Each structure stands twice: as C-alpha cells, then as structure tokens.
C-alpha cells in the first residue's frame, strides 16, 4: 500500500470515527455534496462525500477493494494514476448520485467501481502493462455489482454512483490501453 492507498484508508477511518463520535448527520453537514446553494462554493464537498461510511460493512468492503485494486494501480501504474482515477470517479459518481436522488449519500464505492472497471478492462485490452482482474475477483466483483442493483443489503444503494463509477473506470482503461 503506497502513500495514496494509505492516506485514503486513513482518511476514511478518521472520518468513520468522527461519524461515531459526532454522529452521521453532523459529519454529513460538513462533508456531503452541496445540499444548499449557500454551500456550492465549498469545494472539498464535490469529493469528500467519498470519505463517509454509514456502517461497518460499508467501510470494510470498500477499503478491502480499495486496498487491493487501488494498491495494485498505485504500485504498478504510479500514485498519479490512482489520484486521477479517484478524483474523477468521486466527482462523476457524486454528480450522477445527487442528480438521481439528492445530496445525502457517501462512500468510496463510486471510486471502487471505477477501479474494478479500470483494472479489468485494462487487463483484457492490454496484458503487458501488468494490471489484471483475476477471474475469481471478477466473480466477486460481479456479485458485488449485482447486490447493489437489486438492493440485497440493509441500507439502500447509490445506483448512479455505481454506474457512473464503473463508466469512468472503463473510459479510462479504454483510453489507456489504446496506446
């Protein structure tokens, strides 16, 4: 786990702790996508919704995938590629999510989906580069994708965040594998 993979896991844990201590809504109020016009210029918020988790399962599953795919992308393609994947997926997923359902949402899984789509498609279209999605983990990803679409979990799923996430990672692996 390089510096990006790491600061991210850290920031997510630090934020999850604040949500336990201060409560979910308090932290949302500070970190959610702008939910009032008076907040539109608070720029951290287009990204910081990625940092908030609402259950132990949410955090744990997201950081497992982040650690593994995030970490792969970091070590083999560099810190910079992971930064850009993250900023773009966070911002785009946040955008589509809020459009469909309003600003009240959170989670790294828009980003994790971009890493899934990215690492898979780059492995298919580009063997040499050194990044692949192992067949077993394609299955575990597909099931993970499927669960959200049909809502087979306690709390409701950000479905725009997911389709938007994956689309970004596919677009970027496409553009990258092209060379």
């Amino acid at each position: 786990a390089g510096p990006v993979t790491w600061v991210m896991m850290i920031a997510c844990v630090v934020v999850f702790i604040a949500m336990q201590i201060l409560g979910d809504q308090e932290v949302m109020l500070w970190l959610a996508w702008p939910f009032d016009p008076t907040l539109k210029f608070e720029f951290w918020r287009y990204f910081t919704h990625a940092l908030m988790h609402f259950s132990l399962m949410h955090i744990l599953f997201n950081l497992l995938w982040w650690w593994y795919l995030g970490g792969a992308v970091e070590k083999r393609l560099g810190s910079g590629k992971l930064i850009v994947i993250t900023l773009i997926s966070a911002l785009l997923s946040g955008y589509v999510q809020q459009k469909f359902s309003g600003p009240w949402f959170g989670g790294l899984s828009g980003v994790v989906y971009a890493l899934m789509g990215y690492v898979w498609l780059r492995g298919e279209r580009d063997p040499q580069s050194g990044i692949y999605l192992q067949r077993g983990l394609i299955i575990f990803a597909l099931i993970w994708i499927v669960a959200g679409w049909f809502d087979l979990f306690g709390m409701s799923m950000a479905n725009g965040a997911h389709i938007a996430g994956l689309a970004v990672g596919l677009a970027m692996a496409f553009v990258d594998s092209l060379n």
């Binding site: 979910d24 949302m28 988790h53 609402f54 259950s55 949410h58 997923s93 999510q97 359902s101 009240w104 949402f105 959170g106 989670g107 790294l108 899984s109 828009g110 979990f153 709390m155 409701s156 799923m157 950000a158 479905n159 965040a161 997911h162 996430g165």
Partner: peptide, 4 residues
C-alpha cells in the same frame, strides 16, 4: 442515506 444511500451507500456506495
């Protein structure tokens, strides 16, 4: 509150 939707998770992701």
């Amino acid at each position: 509150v939707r998770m992701x």
